[PDB]
Each structure stands twice: as C-alpha cells, then as structure tokens.
Ligand binder design. Structure first.
Ligand SMILES: [Zn+2]
Lengths: 103, 249, 104, 105, 105, 105
C-alpha cells in the first residue's frame, strides 16, 4: 500500500507528479452532454481535468471521481495551495489521478 | 452568549486605489514604533466629576489588546506613529489619520470628552448595558479605552464595519477576513455614527459590560493578520478567515 | 477535449458566453412539483436557470445537474464572483451549460 | 412558460403564498424520529415554516429537492444569512416550503 | 397535529425527553468500525448522546435522516455553535438523539 | 453494550490501538486511481494513516461510514483543527482508521 502520492503515482503507467505549491487560478465546471467534467488551471497556465466518467473507469472509481471534483472546488473557493498533483499525461488536458495538500 | 448579527462581525480593511490592501508590515516595519507625550490626560465633566490618567499606559494596554494579531510594538520617546491630545470640542471623542508613509496619527480630543462623554450614561444605565455599580469616573475610563482601542484598529489598517466599498483619501474599504460561521462579540470597529459598541456588546453578553469584556473581536484580530501581509483585496485567503469550515457541510 | 469554457461552449449549438465578473445577486431554489429548479440573477438583471431534470438530459447529466446547483449555492453564500457562464439561449431563463470561476 | 423568479413560480400553484422575511432564521429544528422526519424553521417575528416529511404528496422528482432544501436551510441558519422570500403552502401547518429566495439587497 | 416545535414533537413519543443545553459540543467521536458505525457527542458537563447505529428499530424513512443528523452534529462541532435543545430517547445508553434545536435566542 | 467514548469502542476490536495526537493534519492525500481509491493523512512527525479502499473486509453497513470519515478528515485538514485521538488498525501500513475523536477547550 502506498504511503504518499509519489509511491501511488509510481504504480501507474503514463502518470507524472507535478509539484505545484500553488492555488487554483481558474475553476471550470460543465454539465453539458458528453462533457460532464471539471477543468482547473494555475497561474502559470498549467491545466488539468477530472475526466468525464466512462469505460476507462472501474465502478469503484465513480464516487472518487465525484469526491475529487468536490475537493478541487473546495480548494478553489478557499484559495489553499495545492502541493502536488499526480496526473495521466496521455490525456489532454492532463488528467488528475491524485492530489496532495500540505502545510 | 447571544448571536451577533453578521453586519456587526464584518471587518473592513484599507485598500489602495487599485484594490490592494495596505501592508502595515511594509508601512510601519516589522515593529510598530510610536510616540506618546508625557502628560496624564485631564478629562472632567459636570452633572462635576474628576479624573486623570497616563496616556502612555492606555496606548500600552490597548496595543496589547491587539497583540493576538501578531503585531509587535515599542514606545519611542519624542515616519513614526503619533499619539496626542487635542482640544477641538467638536462632537468626536477620537480620530486617526492612516498614513501609508508610516506617519499615522491618532488624536484623543480632551474637550470633546469633557462635553459629551456622559451623554449616554444613564440610557446605558437603565438598559443595563453598564452595571449601575460603576461610577462616573470609570464609565469615562471605559469610554477612553474603547476609544483608544478603536483608534488602534485604524492605525492597523482597519476601517468601520459598514464602509465596504466606500472611498477614502488613500483608496477604498474592502471586506477582509470574513467569518460568519463562528459566533463572537461585535467588532470594536463598529461605526460609532450607527452603533453604540457598549450597548451592542452588552446585547451579546446578555449582561452589563465591564472593561475585561471590551477589546478586538476574533474577526478584528484576523482582519489585522490580513493587513499585516497585505496583498490583493480579492484574494480568497484575504477575504475569508474561516471558509475551511464549509467542508464540514 | 476542451481546455476552457470558450472551447467547451463552442462545441454546442445554441449557446452564448456571458462574462459577468459579478457575485450572484439573487438565488432561488424550488422543490415544487415539475418546477424543481434553481434560478440565479445578477445585479444588472441577467437571469439564468439550472433546468428541471428531464428527457433532454442524458443519464450522465443527472449528477452534474446537482453539482452545478451545489456550485451556484456555494458561490451565492460566499459571494465569490462568477467569471463566465456558458448558457443555452433557447430556454427562458437562459439555461446554464458550464461555469467558470476565475481569481486573478 | 418557465417562471423567471420566485413570484412567477409561486403563482403557478394553488394554495401557495409569498412570505417576505428579509431576516435570518432564528430557530432551526431537525428531527429523525419515525414519521416526523422533517425540518422546522422560525423567524424572530414568530413566523414558522416546515419542510414536509416525504410522502405520497410528493413526486419522485421532488425527493432529492426536498433534501436539497433542508441542506439550504441548515446552511442559511449556520451562516446567519437573510432569507428574502419563502413560497409556502397555506393549507399545511406549519406553512410548508415550496421555494426559497435569497437576495443581497 | 403536525408539531410546531421540538417540544411538541418530543411529546409525541414514548421514552423521550427534552434536554435544554445551550452549550457547544465539547467532544465529537465518529466510528466506521463494523457494527459500531455511529457518532457520539458529549458536552463539558459530561452529558453524552449518540446517533444510533442504523438497524431494525429504524424505518426506511429514517435512514437518510440518520445521516443528516450526523452531518448536522459534525457541522455543529466544527463551528462551536450552541445547541439549544435535544429531544432524546432515554431508554438507550448513551441517550439517543431524536431531534435537535438550534436557536439564536 | 454501546460504547460511550472512543477508548471503549476501540477496546472492542482486535489489532487496534488508540493514538493520542492533539495535532492538526500536516498532509492530506486523495486518490481516485483504480484499485487505490483512498485517502492518506500524515502528521508532522511522520505518522501516517489511511482510510482503506472499500473491499470485502467491509460490511455493507460500513460503506457510507467510510465516505463520512473521508469527509471528516478533509474538513479537519482544511480547517486545521487538532485531532484528539485516532483509533487505528495496527496490522495495516499505513495504519487504518477505525474511529476519530475531536475535542475542544
Ligand atoms: Zn473610527
């Protein structure tokens, strides 16, 4: 079992750790058909998505997708710094797999 | 304690002409150096009362009231914060000029106190905002500490609760450190034209008010923490001081 | 995949972008039968809805409709500014498809 | 025609009325007791309202909105924000909430 | 017949009583452990209450309200809001919460 | 025998221990990645805890409580509140959370 975001991220192919220590600059949310997704960007232009739920997702990922969207919205509203993101890099925008918040 | 209305917990900080909050650390330095002239203050009214007390001990004590904000000070013998007394007798107990250059000045009118300090003595007595126990002497000390603590708020970059969006000589008031979820006493930066702090504080405490009760509220303290770091008035870290609590919903 | 709300809104017919940079002035929420919806308006009178769930919605949109209503309520309570809305114009009030919040 | 505001909405229903409050909720009561799974709110002027126990008077499409309304009222109570208007059914006691408007005037 | 307040509500049930507290929650305990999926709260005077583990004593209509109450108690703990009254079943140990009143008075 | 506090509760289970912390969470990690749908928290001294991936080791009655605990930890992290005690399984690495206690002044 991983102990941290780096260990977790290393268990997956086509993922990378982004070390940010930045607040979310832009939060975008869509309910439009086939584009039910969240996009965030940071001040340096770096952009990430939480993917539209689909066949690439296990049933066990459906609630976590929703939890992540909740966490990102809260992070945006409170202006807290995001420490690290683990993201799939073979998606555009890069697709969030995990997040780390740190003091 | 009763529930203080949001409008009385709202704290407004001084921003410049481009929406950026003044940085009192940058303005005063890491330590706030201030001057206080030697005299004890000589206020007295006729109803005749009599009282004298050192200006220096009250600026001393009032500053310590605000110490939870993380500010640190030091009295410096006569761009430095200036305390003083005046004799305008002009229907205004205290007054402060906030100066971004660092030469902020606070004045305590002595003539105004002698005239209007007890104008609300027994409408406060009978509503029970102050204990019937207290003498004319200590209701004047109460008013003085409140006045001084309130003016310290201005030194530290705060405006009045209801001055969000209002224009001032060096910019505009912008709400800082909002927290509606945590109950607390009314702000000591209530606009005195629209509120009586003692009456509102008593209303909150559900009993008469003494001097161990008065002081900066939780939000007042968080407001100064914002003013100590400055930055954008639209920053969420600056605008909110307990939004994390929203996660518990 | 779109990178921003303008890209997203351009993927759909019958939509328009409103750049508001304003907090929500009025928030209305109804549980009344056949009108289970949210309506918001801004200080200039611009008005938007999140639609009553219906046959015009994919199953994949049911949870997003609720999330958008959550987001609008949260924005109203906190007074954070809404940067842009993408809305369908063939509904009255205009119907929200996407929202952008920006703090720069 | 889709309504544009709470007044339009309230006018579509029999036995509803608009109540103007412009006040914060003074008292919030929440019950999980069997057959009384409901929320009651009251204002400082004594006006009292409920969100009804879910039942046969409710469409399936109202089930989640009932829970949403209870969430909104709790959040309003905790934050002390003013409630502008309630649309409520007058043939229930306490008057039963159909819609709410929050406004910063 | 519909109650107008927590006292009316509490009077409809056997083995319940109203506790007037006007106190903040001092301790909040939350468990996900099997067969002990519950919340326990206590006040500074030692008064302790539970939200019961969901079970056969609960109607299907009480399942979401149990979760709502636990949400409300967590929010109350975090915000330090004063709890005005609890309606509790006294035939449980700890006494079990049936309803809660939060009041600005 | 319904427990009255986190210590009583934790004593009902094998391989659990009480950690008395009185510390705020230093790091919060949340993952939606397949087969690793979990939350990890750590404290400044390096102590690390998880809420486990839901699985066959969990009762149906534990599924919603797992999500509630993840909500509670996220709230604790965002607010910076001190965590008083954790009840955790010691035969997991990171130690797996069974219960939490929050306590104030
Ligand atoms: Zn003033």
């Amino acid at each position: 079992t991983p102990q941290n975001i780096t260990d977790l991220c290393n268990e997956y192919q086509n993922t990378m750790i982004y070390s940010l220590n930045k607040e979310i600059a832009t939060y975008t949310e869509s309910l439009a058909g086939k584009r039910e997704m969240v996009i965030i960007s940071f001040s340096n232009g770096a952009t990430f998505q939480v993917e539209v739920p689909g066949s690439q997702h296990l049933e066990s990922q459906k609630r976590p997708l929703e939890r992540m969207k909740d966490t990102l919205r809260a992070a945006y509203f409170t202006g807290i710094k995001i420490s690290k993101l683990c993201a799939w890099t073979n998606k555009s925008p890069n697709s969030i797999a995990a997040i780390e918040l740190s003091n | 304690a009763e529930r203080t209305p949001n409008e009385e917990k709202k704290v407004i900080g001084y921003a410049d002409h481009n929406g950026q909050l003044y940085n009192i650390t940058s303005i005063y330095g890491p330590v706030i150096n201030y001057t206080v002239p030697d005299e004890n203050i000589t206020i007295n009214t006729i109803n005749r009362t009599q009282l004298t007390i050192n200006y220096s001990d009250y600026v001393r004590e009032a500053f310590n009231e605000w110490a939870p904000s993380g500010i640190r000070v030091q009295q410096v013998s006569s761009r430095v914060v200036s305390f003083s007394t005046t004799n305008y007798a002009d229907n205004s107990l205290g007054s402060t000029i906030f100066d971004p250059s660092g030469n902020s000045r606070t004045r305590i009118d002595i003539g105004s106190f002698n005239r209007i300090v007890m104008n609300n003595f027994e409408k406060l007595k009978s509503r029970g905002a102050i204990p019937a126990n207290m003498s004319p002497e200590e209701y004047i000390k109460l008013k003085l500490r409140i006045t001084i603590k309130h003016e310290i708020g201005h030194i530290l970059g705060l405006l009045h609760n209801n001055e969000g969006g209002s224009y001032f000589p060096h910019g505009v008031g912008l709400e800082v450190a909002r927290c509606r979820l945590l109950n607390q006493a009314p702000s000591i930066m209530l606009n005195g034209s629209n509120y009586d702090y003692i009456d509102r504080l008593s209303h909150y405490l559900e009993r008469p008010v003494t001097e161990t009760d008065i002081g900066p509220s939780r939000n007042d303290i968080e407001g100064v923490r914002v003013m100590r770091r400055g930055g954008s008035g639209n920053s969420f870290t600056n605008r909110f001081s307990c939004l994390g609590l929203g996660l518990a919903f």
